[PDB]
C-alpha cells in the first residue's frame, strides 16, 4: 500500500465502516469505564489495564524512540498491530526530539491516529531535565490531541522500563500534566485513558487517581 492513499481512505471512514475490516477483536470506547463510573474530571479520565493496540479511540500514544522506526515494548506492539504503512509514514517524519511528539495515521489499529512521543532516558538518577522532558512528552501529545479534534486518547507509561524513569515519579508527572491540561481543556475531550500493561503501574495509578481528579 501507499501510506498517503491508505491514510486518506481510513480518515474518511466511520467506526461502522472500519469495524467491517478490522483484523483483530477490539475494545470499544463505551466499554471503558470513566474513573467516576468505576467509583467532575473523574468523568474525563480512565485507568485501563490491557493492550493499548486494541483500543478503538481517536488516538493512542506511542512511547517511541528518537528514530520513530519502532523497537521493543509498546512501540514494537504498535508497529506490528498498525502494519508497515505506520513505519512508512514515520520514515517520512525524519525522527522526533526528546519531549516532542508527532502524529500519524493508525492504519490497521482501531485507533484513528498514533501520537509518537520520545521520552527522556535516565541512565542514572532522574534529574530536572528528565522531569521537564517527561512533562513535555505529555504536553506535546495533548497539543496534537487539541489540534486534530481528538476526543479520546490513551497514554502508556512513557520512559518507564529500559528508559529508566522510576514508575512512581513517572505516574506523578503523567497525572499532574493531564490534570492541569484538563482544567483548561476539559471541554475538548470525552476521555483520557491511562493504559497500563504492568501490575506495578496499575497499583501506582489506582492509588493516585482520586488525589488528582476526585
From Swiss-Prot:
Domain Macro, first and last residues per copy: 40-213
Activity regulation (UniProt): Subject to product inhibition by ADP-ribose.
Protein name (Swiss-Prot/TrEMBL): ADP-ribose glycohydrolase MACROD2
Assigned keywords, A-Z: DNA damage, Hydrolase, Isopeptide bond, Nucleus, Ubl conjugation
Localisation: Nucleus
Mutagenesis or variant effect for residue 79 to A: Reduced hydrolase activity
Biological process, per Gene Ontology: brain development; DNA damage response; peptidyl-glutamate ADP-deribosylation; protein de-ADP-ribosylation; purine nucleoside metabolic process; response to bacterium
Covered residues, full protein: 9 to 241 of 425
Domain of life (superkingdom): Eukaryota
Annotated effect of mutating residue 73 to A: Abolished hydrolase activity and ability to bind ADP-D-ribose
Binding site for substrate: 50-52, 63-65, 70-75, 158-164, 197
Cross-link (Glycyl lysine isopeptide (Lys-Gly) (interchain with G-Cter in ubiquitin)): 143
EC numbers on record: 3.5.1.-, 3.2.2.-
GO MF: ADP-ribosylglutamate hydrolase activity; deacetylase activity; hydrolase activity, acting on glycosyl bonds; O-acetyl-ADP-ribose deacetylase activity
Amino acid at each position: 500500500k501507499v501510506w498517503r492513499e491508505e491514510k486518506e481512505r481510513l480518515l474518511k471512514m466511520t467506526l461502522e465502516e472500519r469495524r467491517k475490516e478490522y483484523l483483530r477483536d477490539y475494545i470499544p470506547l463505551n466499554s471503558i469505564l470513566s474513573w467516576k463510573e468505576e467509583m467532575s474530571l473523574t468523568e474525563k479520565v480512565s485507568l485501563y489495564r490491557g493492550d493499548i493496540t486494541l483500543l478503538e479511540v481517536d488516538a493512542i500514544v506511542n512511547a517511541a524512540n528518537a528514530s520513530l522506526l519502532g523497537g521493543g515494548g509498546v512501540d514494537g506492539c504498535i508497529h506490528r498491530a498498525a502494519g508497515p504503512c505506520l513505519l512508512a509514514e514515520c520514515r517520512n517524519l525524519n525522527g522526533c526530539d526528546t519531549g516532542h511528539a508527532k502524529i500519524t495515521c493508525g492504519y490497521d489499529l482501531p485507533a484513528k491516529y498514533v501520537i509518537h512521543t520520545v521520552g527522556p532516558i535516565a541512565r542514572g538518577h532522574i534529574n530536572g531535565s528528565h522531569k521537564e522532558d517527561l512533562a513535555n512528552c505529555y504536553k506535546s501529545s495533548l497539543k496534537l490531541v487539541k489540534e486534530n479534534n481528538i476526543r479520546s486518547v490513551a497514554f502508556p507509561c512513557i520512559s518507564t522500563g529500559i528508559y529508566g524513569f522510576p514508575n512512581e515519579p513517572a505516574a506523578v508527572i503523567a497525572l499532574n500534566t493531564i490534570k492541569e491540561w484538563l482544567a483548561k481543556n476539559h471541554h475538548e475531550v470525552d476521555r483520557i485513558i491511562f493504559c497500563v500493561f504492568l501490575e506495578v503501574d496499575f497499583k501506582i495509578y489506582k492509588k493516585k487517581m482520586n488525589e488528582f481528579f476526585s
